[PDB]
Design a protein around this ligand. Structure first.
Ligand code: CLA
Ligand code: CLA
Ligand code: CLA
Ligand code: CLA
Ligand code: CLA
Ligand code: CLA
Ligand code: CLA
Ligand code: CLA
Ligand SMILES: CC1=C(C#C/C(C)=C/C=C/C(C)=C/C=C/C=C(C)/C=C/C=C(\C)C#CC2=C(C)C[C@@H](O)CC2(C)C)C(C)(C)C[C@H](O)C1
Ligand SMILES: CC1=C(C#C/C(C)=C/C=C/C(C)=C/C=C/C=C(C)/C=C/C=C(C)/C=C/C2=C(C)CCCC2(C)C)C(C)(C)C[C@H](O)C1
Ligand SMILES: CC1=C(C/C=C(\C)CCC[C@H](C)CCC[C@H](C)CCCC(C)C)C(=O)c2ccccc2C1=O
Lengths: 151, 742, 69, 42, 129, 170
């Protein structure tokens, strides 16, 4: 019984098939994740990744930011998350411009049109996820605290 | 009887002929120098025995006799420490008043005004204050006389003569054959049972019969010359039974297994002796007796000549699972045919043990009156941290030498080494990521705190008064060790160390040991430690794993362990050898150990060491400034280096002026190293060309053509001066600081 | 301090039992050497009684600790 | 005395250490009997 | 070869040199013979101006045992040279007689010293009482 | 095969009876390790020092020079440590031992017998046969005097009486 094998049945490729790299659980998770999901539009891939990332960005800026002790902590945290989203979406845009030569096909992220659709989805998702985090934290007192509301 | 003694008789002739021909040991160097590089190449490769000879037998013989020469040097060194204690010390004065007299076993001659170094250490004595802790060792041994120190000096001298004789005898008269050295089972049986086990058993016996009665009489208050001589405890069993009434029954309780009779002198007290601030010697006697039994029992594990025992080859070849291929197959063949593989393991272990020694010896002070002799505590911690770090980097040095030279892929197919080399990119990339993560999240917290404190934002810092990074796991383990007596160590009376919590132990109104509370500053400096250890591992591991080949240089093993580069091509392959990762990792070891000894020095002065005032208040040496100032780099600069360097800078005209001189001299040597580190050989060779011209002009050119040092030697000289300069700076700073204030 | 006792025939019983237990165990588990009359040498006996004294002493000290004696 | 032991004592490190120890030794002795010589006395 | 009753039940001779074992047996024999003859002699008569084990303890204070140890140690150092060399490299009846009498003296002295632990009496005293 | 002195011990390989006074006595095997020439140099030097010292004791109790105080020989060691005459004797012994170092180098180079200083002013050695007889006597006296001086000093340390007075008393 050997749990580590050469990657893709190619010994000289620079990878090793391992339980962490090539278990069915790892393969299922990667395929399930939006970036590698089959049947998913590049814009939709960006929306799902963006909603996730924008949602969790608000919390560190809100809880640990300069204006954390102020009553405007959530607004500052959302604005800081939003500013980070705008900087990152600029990074996505410039990477797309330089990396990919313009081609007609848009069905893949690794295309100029596909990365532009991905960046579009990521911005919409990230602003929406950040907004969703803002709405939820504002409405729920427990989220406003660090979990010490029960205490 | 396949384990047998086999020796070649009269192998090598004892002649001075090869002494008179420097370089005799290698074919390259034996034809004589033509350039000055030969001179350096002589010393650089002398102990590299497996670079001179092909045969493992002659290599092993040279190593065995060189180990006897080293033991002869250690015994001569010990004999000198005992003689300087007997003749040039205030040991007898220190025995009467251990808390006021300062240990001193070195007296200087009056020559150029240097007799100012004979400072007033106390006891009607002038000499250099010594911090090696020998006085506390000798009091723990029960010496109580300078005559007995002369007898120990003679015993060391006799042992030094016997080891230098044994090295000569075992190289030149009766040198063992290779099949003698390749008895790892026999050697382990004897070094566990005989060396460590009878070493502990004999030392426990000495402690029970000499250290325990003499130190009970010393702590009762009896003056050293009123104490009976150590053999009078051996004969007068009645007199020994006065101090320990269990001696009235003799060895019947031992053999009848009635061991609870021996609880008078074999205790499990824990904690410290209130009189001396050291470990209870009854605990130390029981400790060494228990270690002796397990070490002797352990040395019966391996099979030698009678069918009982383990074959280590069988143990290793049976340990293989589904992740690890053939497993530990082939490792026994490695470790009985490669000396470097053994030295890599044993140096990493000896360094780890020396590091363990420094932590355990400060926390649980093992000698009487060593805890309140703060120069000794700081000195032996700092010393064993440096010996530990150096030996750990030499473990990686000889792991690199093994990989370059003794590694054979044919005998190492699909075993643990093959699999590590076959995923070394994953190992080094994950180690690289953890070092970046941990430099950001330990030192960047310091940069955050520097920035916030500089910006006036004290509420935005990582501190105990602000955002609290508490070490909850370390505090919890401290809680467990304070609750352990009577709960999870029920027969213990006190804690293993008062560092975990509990009482303040004071001796002569100075704190012997007291709880070391951990806060945000301790969290930050421990993650600094985890970061610096991780990066030193990354450089040393990256050198071991990439010693034979890379994607950069596919044939690095053909260039050797120690080569400077493979040219300016491929972008530049400067410092591509395994040697150059030992070279780069000794700097990061220096960085790691320097922060460890700085953390120890500041934390012990700030939160442990000091004077016990009335009502049990402890006024510490630097007054508890660690908690709010070791969180910023400016605090380390200001409240640790600047504040405590006062003693070295202001030492001139006193007995500590030698430390001020070594402080400046080592700053000089450290800076002088950077000439060798930042420069390259080609500059110095062209400069030497102009100097050679000036010699040629006066017809005074040497016949051994001067060369700039090799690229590797320029690196080695830079590193050696850097380590000497940095460590000597810290040595002078630590010693003048703690001799003045502690 | 754990309660130990002076030597009695019960201590002798524990030592003897542990020694015989290890003689039989050594006949079964020692890999390199008529259940006891095949290949039984002095080393095998010496090793098994060595463990019998180790096991016996551990057993005596523990049974004295817990009260069984 | 053995010619190979004398050829060993003629080696560069032995002569260097002996000569600079002899040199150091008469600097030490001259500064012992006649210390504090900041100047040529005249 | 002398004193061979075929008595090696634990087979010590299989796992230690018969020369070292015979040297140990003969040295133990002789020492025990001197010791047993000594035990009875101390009770029978005392050299002018002068216990199985306690008398040893008194003698070490007087230095009588210490002088005997030093001189026996010198002879024994020469004997160590002899044992190493032997390992490296009428009369027949007398060798068997010496071995049997020495074995009897080993048991004899062993009995005398345990008799001393029991009744605190010398071997002649044990016969007398 | 075996030693003349110790019947049960084998004769040391390096002891072939070439040195006079040899009886094969070397159990600890010092001749198997070290040069016998050097060891006979040392044996004769230790013995000659011991013979001069045993005559030194006996004459020093019987007579002492009028300019020196009357006292015991170990007390004489300490007095001449503090007086200066010990340093005199040590200097002149050391001076002679310089040429003794040269002499031992001559022995190691094969060109001198280990105890020969060609010191025969009174011509007592006539031919080779009497020289061999005297030489065996010299080594026997040398060894006997080494044991004797140790006895004289140790007996003085235990009982504070000189050798002639210790024979006279008790
Ligand atoms: C091994 C550890 C050790 C150390 C570090 C020291 C260190 C010291 N000792 Mg101690 N000592 C030791 C062992 C040690 N000793 C032992 C084992 C003994 C017993 C014999 C002594 C007995 C002793 C006495 C009695 C005294 C010292 C003194 C001293 C001090 C000065 C010594 C000096 O200047 O010599 C310099 C002497 C020279 C002859 C100069 C050396 C120059 C030559 C060329 C050395 C070269 C070596 C050579 C080249 C090597 C190659 C050999 C050759 C064949 C090529 C110094 C602090 C003195 C002291 O403390 O006074 C207060 C003092 O009086 N020592
Ligand atoms: C029980 C027997 C025994 C003991 C005590 C030792 C002890 C030692 N061996 Mg080992 N060795 C043994 C058996 C033993 N060996 C066997 C059977 C083999 C063959 C497989 C080897 C093969 C071997 C090699 C190849 C090497 C050693 C080395 C060493 C030294 C390690 C350095 C050290 O810590 O020394 C310091 C500790 C000491 C205690 C120093 C004391 C020195 C003596 C020799 C110890 C024993 C003295 C004596 C037995 C005590 C009598 C007690 C009396 C007063 C009552 C150490 C002296 C290494 C070394 O350094 O070589 C010299 C080394 O390279 N040994
Ligand atoms: C290698 C170490 C070593 C050595 C050489 C010795 C040597 C000795 N021990 Mg010590 N001893 C040791 C380890 C050692 N012991 C350890 C580890 C322990 C703890 C279990 C003891 C506990 C111990 C006790 C309690 C006594 C000795 C005694 C003795 C002496 C034996 C006299 C006798 O049989 O009376 C034994 C008396 C009987 C009635 C039987 C002898 C000098 C005895 C002695 O004379 O003490 C000074 C004694 O009473 N030993
Ligand atoms: C038990 C410990 C041990 C042993 C047996 C060895 C043995 C060996 N090592 Mg290893 N090594 C060790 C510890 C050890 N080392 C440690 C602790 C380190 C980390 C520093 C290293 C790092 C290391 C490297 C990087 C290399 C070796 C090499 C070698 C080999 C030859 C070295 C030689 O000829 O130098 C002869 C000795 C010298 C040149 C001495 C000079 C060293 C310094 C500069 C002197 C120190 C002076 C003093 C301490 C401070 C100065 C004071 C000043 C004020 C006067 C030999 C196999 C080399 C080799 O050839 O590989 C096979 C090699 O490349 N080792
Ligand atoms: C104080 C000087 C210094 C600093 C800052 C570094 C920094 C670093 N060294 Mg180097 N090194 C130094 C001296 C220094 N070294 C010296 C003197 C030697 C002599 C031999 C070496 C030899 C050496 C080797 C051989 C190795 C390193 C490694 C590392 C890295 C450790 C990983 C890490 O902590 O990442 C975190 C980064 C830092 C701690 C840098 C400080 C950044 C702070 C936290 C704030 C960041 C500022 C921020 C970016 C501002 C952005 C805005 C601005 C751009 C406008 C890191 C890049 C290792 C490496 O690269 O592998 C991981 C490695 O293997 N170093
Ligand atoms: C059946 C008989 C018997 C009995 C009742 C015991 C019972 C005990 N043994 Mg013993 N022991 C036995 C057989 C026995 N053992 C055998 C056969 C051996 C092999 C030689 C040992 C070896 C042994 C050692 C070496 C020690 C004990 C100890 C102990 C005590 C502590 C256990 C504990 O909770 O620590 C929990 C420990 C932890 C680390 C928890 C995690 C316990 C009362 C210890 C003790 O305190 O002795 C007084 C101890 O040091 N035992
Ligand atoms: C072989 C052993 C041996 C021998 C021959 C002697 C013989 C002698 N001893 Mg000694 N003695 C011995 C062992 C020996 N002892 C031992 C083992 C001890 C204990 C350490 C002593 C302690 C000892 C003391 C303390 C004294 C003697 C005395 C004597 C003398 C008494 C004369 C006498 O009464 O005889 C019989 C005489 C007659 C019947 C009529 C006259 C005599 C010469 C005494 C003497 O004279 O010494 C100066 C004396 O005081 N002996
Ligand atoms: C011939 C060379 C020579 C010289 C010049 C000296 C000089 C001295 N010796 Mg030395 N001595 C020498 C050879 C020499 N010795 C030799 C070869 C030996 C034999 C080993 C000695 C043995 C010796 C001893 C034992 C003593 C002297 C003493 C003396 C001092 C005598 C004081 C005095 O003049 O009053 C005396 C005048 C006379 C005797 C007139 C005749 C003087 C320093 C003595 C002294 O006091 O030293 C401090 C002393 O005790 N010497
Ligand atoms: C101070 C002073 C003066 C003086 C003086 C002087 C200079 C005195 C010089 C004294 C000397 C040099 C004494 C030499 C002693 C040597 C001995 C006893 C050797 C023992 C070896 C043995 C038994 C052996 C052996 C071995 C052999 C061979 C073979 C081996 O395998 C085995 C073995 C180890 C057993 C005097 C006294 C005049 C008075 C004056 O007022 C003050
Ligand atoms: C400290 C100091 C002093 C001094 C001093 C000096 C010079 C001290 C010298 C001490 C000496 C020479 C001791 C050696 C004695 C000989 C022995 C023990 C051999 C015995 C024979 C044996 C064991 C066996 C013999 C054998 C037997 C069985 C019989 C046959 C033969 C053999 C087989 C060989 C002073 C005076 C300067 C004063 C000052 O205060 C400093
Ligand atoms: C100064 C310097 C030189 C020149 C240094 C030389 C030629 C060393 C010569 C120094 C003299 C000749 C001997 C040194 C003696 C010292 C006083 C003490 C030395 C102690 C040990 C050597 C025994 C290089 O060759 C070099 C090469 C590569 C990188 C950096 C450098 C570098 O910095």
């Amino acid at each position: 019984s050997q749990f580590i094998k050469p990657y893709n049945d190619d010994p000289f490729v620079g990878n090793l098939a391992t339980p962490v790299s090539t278990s069915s659980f790892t393969k299922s998770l990667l395929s399930n994740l939006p970036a590698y999901r089959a049947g998913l539009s590049p814009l939709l891939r960006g929306v799902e990744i963006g909603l996730t990332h924008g949602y969790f960005l608000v919390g560190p800026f809100y809880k640990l930011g300069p204006l954390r002790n102020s009553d405007v902590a959530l607004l500052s945290g959302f604005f800081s998350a939003l500013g980070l989203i705008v900087i990152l979406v600029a990074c996505l845009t410039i990477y797309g411009v330089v990396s990919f030569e313009e081609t007609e096909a848009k069905d893949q992220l690794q295309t100029a049109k596909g990365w532009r659709q991905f960046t579009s989805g990521w911005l919409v998702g990230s602003v929406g996820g950040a907004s969703f985090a803002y709405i939820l934290i504002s409405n729920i007192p427990f989220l406003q605290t660090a979990g010490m509301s029960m205490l | 009887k396949k384990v047998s003694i086999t020796v070649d008789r009269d192998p090598v002739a004892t002649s001075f002929e090869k002494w008179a021909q420097p370089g005799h040991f290698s074919r390259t160097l034996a034809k004589g120098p033509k350039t000055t590089t030969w001179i350096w190449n002589l010393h650089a490769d002398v102990h590299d025995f497996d670079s001179h000879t092909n045969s493992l037998e002659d290599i092993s013989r040279k190593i065995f006799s060189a180990h006897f020469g080293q033991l002869s040097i250690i015994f001569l060194w010990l004999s000198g420490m005992y003689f300087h204690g007997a003749r040039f010390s205030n040991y007898s004065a220190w025995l009467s008043n251990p808390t006021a007299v300062k240990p001193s076993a070195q007296v200087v001659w009056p020559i150029v005004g240097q007799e100012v170094l004979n400072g007033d250490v106390g006891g009607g004595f002038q000499g250099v204050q010594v911090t090696s802790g020998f006085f506390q060792i000798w009091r723990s041994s029960g010496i109580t006389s300078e005559v007995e120190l002369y007898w120990c000096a003679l015993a060391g001298l006799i042992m030094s003569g016997l080891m230098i004789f044994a090295g000569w005898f075992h190289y030149h008269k009766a040198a063992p054959k290779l099949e003698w050295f390749q008895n790892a089972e026999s050697m382990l049986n004897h070094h566990l049972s005989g060396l460590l086990g009878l070493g502990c058993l004999s030392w426990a016996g000495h402690q029970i019969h000499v250290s325990l009665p003499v130190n009970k009489l010393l702590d009762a208050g009896v003056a050293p010359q009123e104490i009976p001589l150590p053999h009078e405890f051996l004969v007068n069993r009645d007199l020994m039974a006065q101090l320990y009434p269990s001696f009235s029954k003799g060895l019947v309780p031992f053999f009848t297994l009635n061991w609870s009779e021996y609880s008078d002198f074999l205790t499990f007290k824990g904690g410290l002796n209130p009189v001396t601030g050291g470990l209870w010697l009854s605990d130390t006697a029981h400790h060494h007796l228990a270690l002796a039994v397990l070490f002797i029992v352990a040395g019966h594990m391996y099979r030698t000549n009678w069918g009982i025992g383990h074959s280590m080859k069988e143990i290793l070849e049976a340990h293989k699972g589904p992740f690890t291929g053939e497993g530990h197959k082939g490792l026994y063949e490695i470790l009985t045919t490669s000396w470097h593989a053994q030295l890599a393991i044993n140096l990493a272990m000896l360094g780890s043990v020396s590091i363990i020694v420094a932590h355990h010896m400060y926390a649980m002070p093992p000698y009487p009156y060593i805890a309140t002799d703060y120069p000794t505590q700081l000195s032996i911690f700092t010393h064993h941290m440096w010996i530990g770090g150096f030996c750990v980097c030499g473990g990686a040095a000889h792991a690199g030498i093994f990989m370059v030279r003794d590694y054979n892929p044919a005998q190492n197919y699909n075993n643990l080494l093959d699999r590590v080399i076959r995923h070394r990119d994953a190992i080094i990339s994950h180690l690289n990521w953890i070092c970046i993560f941990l430099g950001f999240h330990s030192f960047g917290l310091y940069i955050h705190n520097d920035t916030m404190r500089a910006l006036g934002r004290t509420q935005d810092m990582f501190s105990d008064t602000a955002i609290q990074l508490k070490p909850v796991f370390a505090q919890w383990v401290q809680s467990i060790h304070t609750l352990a007596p009577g709960n999870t160590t029920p027969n213990a009376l006190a804690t293993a160390s008062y560092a975990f919590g509990g009482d303040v132990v004071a001796v002569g109104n100075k704190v012997a040991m007291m709880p070391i509370s951990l806060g945000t500053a301790d969290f930050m400096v421990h993650h600094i430690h985890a970061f610096t250890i991780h990066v030193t591992v990354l450089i040393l591991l990256k050198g071991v794993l990439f010693s034979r080949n890379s994607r950069l240089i596919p044939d690095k093993a053909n260039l050797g362990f120690r080569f400077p580069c493979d040219g300016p091509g491929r972008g530049g392959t400067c410092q591509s050898s395994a040697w150059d990762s030992v070279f780069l990792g000794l700097f990061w070891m220096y960085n790691c150990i320097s922060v460890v000894i700085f953390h120890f020095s500041w934390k012990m002065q700030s939160d442990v060491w000091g004077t016990v005032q009335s009502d049990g208040t402890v006024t510490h040496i630097t007054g508890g400034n660690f908690a709010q100032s070791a969180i910023t780099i400016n605090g380390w600069l200001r409240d640790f280096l600047w504040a405590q360097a006062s003693q070295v800078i202001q030492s001139y005209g006193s007995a500590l002026s030698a430390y001020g001189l070594i402080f400046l001299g080592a700053h000089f040597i450290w800076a002088f190293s950077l000439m060798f580190l930042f420069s390259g050989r080609g500059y110095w060779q062209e400069l030497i060309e102009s100097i050679v011209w000036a010699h040629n002009k006066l017809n005074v050119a040497p016949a051994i053509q001067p060369r700039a040092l090799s690229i590797t030697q320029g690196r080695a000289v830079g590193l050696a001066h850097y380590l000497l300069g940095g460590i000597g700076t810290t040595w002078a700073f630590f010693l003048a600081r703690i001799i003045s204030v502690g | 301090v754990p309660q130990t006792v002076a030597w009695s025939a019960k201590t002798g019983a524990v030592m003897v039992l542990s020694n015989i237990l290890c003689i039989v165990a050594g006949r079964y588990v020692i890999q390199v050497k008529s259940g006891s009359f095949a290949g039984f040498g002095l080393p095998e006996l010496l090793a098994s009684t060595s463990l019998g004294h180790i096991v016996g002493s551990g057993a005596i000290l523990g049974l004295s600790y817990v009260g069984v004696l | 005395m053995d010619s190979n032991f004398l050829k060993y004592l003629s080696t560069a490190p032995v002569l260097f250490t002996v000569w600079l120890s002899f040199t150091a030794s008469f600097i030490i002795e001259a500064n012992r009997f006649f210390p504090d010589m900041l100047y040529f006395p005249m | 070869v002398p004193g061979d009753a075929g008595f090696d039940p634990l087979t010590i001779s299989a796992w230690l040199d018969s020369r070292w074992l015979r040297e140990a047996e003969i040295k133990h024999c002789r020492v025990a013979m001197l010791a047993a003859a000594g035990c009875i002699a101390q009770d029978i008569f005392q050299f002018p101006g002068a216990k199985m084990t306690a008398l040893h303890d008194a003698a070490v204070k007087a230095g009588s045992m210490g002088q005997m140890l030093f001189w026996i140690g010198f002879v024994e150092a020469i004997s160590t040279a002899a044992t190493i060399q032997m390992l490296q490299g009428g009369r027949a009846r007398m060798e068997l007689s010496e071995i049997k009498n020495g074995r009897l003296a080993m048991i004899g002295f062993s009995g005398m010293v345990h008799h001393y632990f029991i009744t605190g009496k010398g071997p002649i005293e044990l016969l007398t009482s | 095969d075996f030693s003349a002195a110790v019947p049960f011990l084998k004769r040391p390989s390096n002891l072939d009876g070439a040195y006079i006074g040899d009886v094969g006595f070397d159990p600890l095997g010092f001749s198997d390790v070290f040069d016998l020439r050097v060891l006979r140099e040392a044996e004769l030097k230790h013995g000659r020092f011991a013979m001069l010292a045993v005559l030194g004791f006996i004459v020093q109790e019987l007579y002492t020079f009028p300019f020196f105080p009357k006292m015991a020989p170990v007390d004489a060691h300490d007095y001449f440590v503090k007086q200066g005459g010990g340093s005199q004797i040590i200097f002149w012994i050391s001076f002679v031992e310089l040429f003794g170092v040269v002499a031992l180098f001559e022995t190691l180079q094969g060109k001198r017998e280990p105890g020969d200083f060609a010191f025969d002013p009174l011509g007592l050695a006539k031919d080779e046969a009497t020289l061999e007889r005297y030489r065996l006597a010299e080594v026997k006296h040398a060894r006997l005097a080494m044991i004797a001086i140790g006895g004289f000093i140790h007996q003085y340390w235990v009982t504070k009486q000189t050798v002639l007075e210790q024979l006279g008393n008790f």
